[PDB]
């Protein structure tokens, strides 16, 4: 009496609208009892020829395993192809019906969904993260070795999982990122779209991508879930959080002026140096438009690093996302007892830390959601968790308006402008002369619905900054995402 396990049917993964993303598909695994096979050797060359194997290599396998009362031959043939072999009627050739995953959207949502191993266990993406929920519990039955004595346990199927992903926005993001990588001859890239109200990840695409239905020649670079794994210094894209701290201090208002002449600031031995050095007096919006490191450094010395560090920590920078995905990196938000001037300045202009595109999107979602953080979700949210109010609604509103001016004002990031709508955001450049071009923003600016981060890894064409490399991708994908979600033009 042997106990043999009945595989459970793995749960269906859908997008937020019920579009199938991962489906357990019937296949046939052909095993054999060598000791039986050993009695039908004249059938072997026909079995071999069928099974794709070579006659002598196949004969060699069976002969040495002449002791074992079981071994596999082939796993997950089609039901009717593996029947053309059950049609040879070779003694000792029995078969199991099994499930394999199919991924209808393939490379478009590869990293987010991931894939299963040969045992049908989650190995990447959601397949891994919700392996328990999807796998179910296999059943078993007592068998003589002849006859199935009884089902001693019932194989219960895995449960259905609806992702936060909108496959329509995922196709738009995948296509627009792919096109931007080839126009800038870039190595790699990420694009994350979030619902600012619900914490839902509506799209997560990485380039390069792969077909999880065919992982034969799978390069590790194609497999890398960059949005959740790649850490970088977010540079000018975290200046809105430095500004949030400045406006919450009671010492700063948007019409306040900082003298950034002559584009440099000596702090003892170290000199802070602006990317553009053609300014004296700038208002707070101007400090953002110019991305003046001098401007944000003087504000940071006035308010203290502690206030900036606290805002950055509260919007989740350098913190666990709680998404429980395989590779994900948390990055680093460094803390100090005593913040010297250098570390105060570098934190303020975004080199004092490292973040992922997902953390950066999540921080932008909090700012867009009038200062209320909502936990990240890769699964459809029906009941929205209570937020944490991490930035006062009034500060969040003021910083939103500044970021709208960053995109729309004269001297601003005009390429980020969204045809149809008011958008808000900040470009950045994170040096690895290899660098990442960043853009982080949300729309509509006056009533935000969507936050988005674009990362372009080593753009290898003339165009340098976030403000012309990443910003146009944000424009096209945001215009598309807002209309697919029937968000009314403002």
Curated annotation (Swiss-Prot):
Bilayer topology: Single-pass membrane protein
Lineage: Bacteria, Pseudomonadati, Pseudomonadota, Gammaproteobacteria, Pseudomonadales
Highest taxon above the source species: Bacteria
The enzyme's E.C. designation: 3.4.16.4
Major site of localization recorded for this protein: membrane
Function per UniProt: Catalyzes cross-linking of the peptidoglycan cell wall at the division septum. Binds penicillin.
Involved pathway(s): Cell wall biogenesis; peptidoglycan biosynthesis
UniProt-recorded name of the protein: Peptidoglycan D,D-transpeptidase FtsI
Reaction(s) catalysed (UniProt annotation): Preferential cleavage: (Ac)2-L-Lys-D-Ala-|-D-Ala. Also transpeptidation of peptidyl-alanyl moieties that are N-acyl substituents of D-alanine
């Amino acid at each position: 009496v042997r106990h043999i396990a009945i595989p459970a049917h793995r749960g269906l993964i859908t997008d937020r609208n019920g579009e199938p993303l991962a489906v357990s598909t019937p296949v046939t695994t052909l095993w054999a009892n060598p000791k039986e096979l050993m009695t039908a050797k004249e059938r072997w060359p026909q079995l071999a020829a069928a099974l794709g194997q070579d006659t002598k290599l196949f004969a060699d396998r069976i002969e040495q395993n002449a002791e074992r009362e079981f071994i596999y031959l082939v796993r997950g043939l089609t039901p009717e192809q593996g029947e053309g072999v059950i049609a040879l009627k070779v003694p000792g050739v029995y078969s199991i019906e099994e499930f394999r995953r199919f991924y209808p959207a393939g490379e478009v949502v590869a990293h987010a969904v991931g894939f299963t191993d040969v045992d049908d266990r989650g190995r990447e993406g959601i397949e891994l993260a919700f392996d328990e929920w999807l796998a179910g519990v296999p059943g078993k039955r007592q068998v003589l070795k002849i006859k199935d004595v009884q089902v001693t346990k019932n194989a219960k199927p895995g449960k259905t999982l609806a992702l936060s992903i909108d496959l329509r926005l995922q196709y738009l993001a995948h296509r627009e990122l792919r096109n931007a990588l080839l126009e800038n001859g870039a190595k790699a890239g990420s694009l994350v779209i979030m619902d600012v109200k619900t914490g839902e990840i509506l799209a997560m695409t990485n380039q390069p991508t792969y077909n999880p239905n065919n992982r034969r020649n799978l390069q590790p670079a194609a497999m890398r879930n960059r949005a959740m794994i790649d850490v970088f210094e977010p540079g000018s894209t975290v200046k809105p959080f430095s500004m949030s701290a400045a406006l919450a201090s009671g010492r700063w208002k948007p019409s306040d002026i900082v003298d950034v002449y002559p584009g440099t600031l000596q702090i003892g031995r170290y000199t802070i140096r602006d990317v553009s050095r053609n300014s004296r007096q700038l208002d707070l919006t101007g400090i953002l438009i110019k991305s003046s490191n001098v401007g944000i450094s003087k504000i940071a010395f006035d308010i203290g690093a502690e206030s900036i560090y606290s805002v950055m920590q509260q919007v989740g920078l350098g913190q666990d996302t709680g998404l429980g995905f395989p590779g994900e990196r948390v990055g680093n938000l460094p803390n100090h007892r005593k913040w010297p001037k250098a570390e105060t300045a570098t934190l303020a202009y975004g080199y004092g830390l490292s973040v992922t595109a997902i953390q950066l999107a999540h921080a932008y979602a909090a700012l867009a959601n009038d200062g209320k953080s909502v936990p990240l979700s890769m699964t459809r949210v029906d009941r929205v968790p209570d937020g944490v109010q991490v930035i006062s609604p009034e500060v969040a509103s003021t910083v939103q308006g500044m970021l709208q001016q960053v995109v729309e004002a004269q001297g601003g990031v005009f390429r980020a402008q969204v045809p149809g709508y008011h958008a808000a955001g900040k470009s950045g450049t994170a040096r690895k002369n290899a660098y990442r071009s960043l853009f982080a923003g949300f729309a509509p600016a006056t009533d935000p619905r969507i936050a988005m981060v674009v990362v372009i890894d080593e753009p290898s064409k003339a165009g340098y900054f976030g403000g012309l490399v990443s910003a146009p991708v944000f424009s096209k994908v945001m215009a598309g995402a807002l209309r697919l979600m029937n968000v009314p033009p403002d």
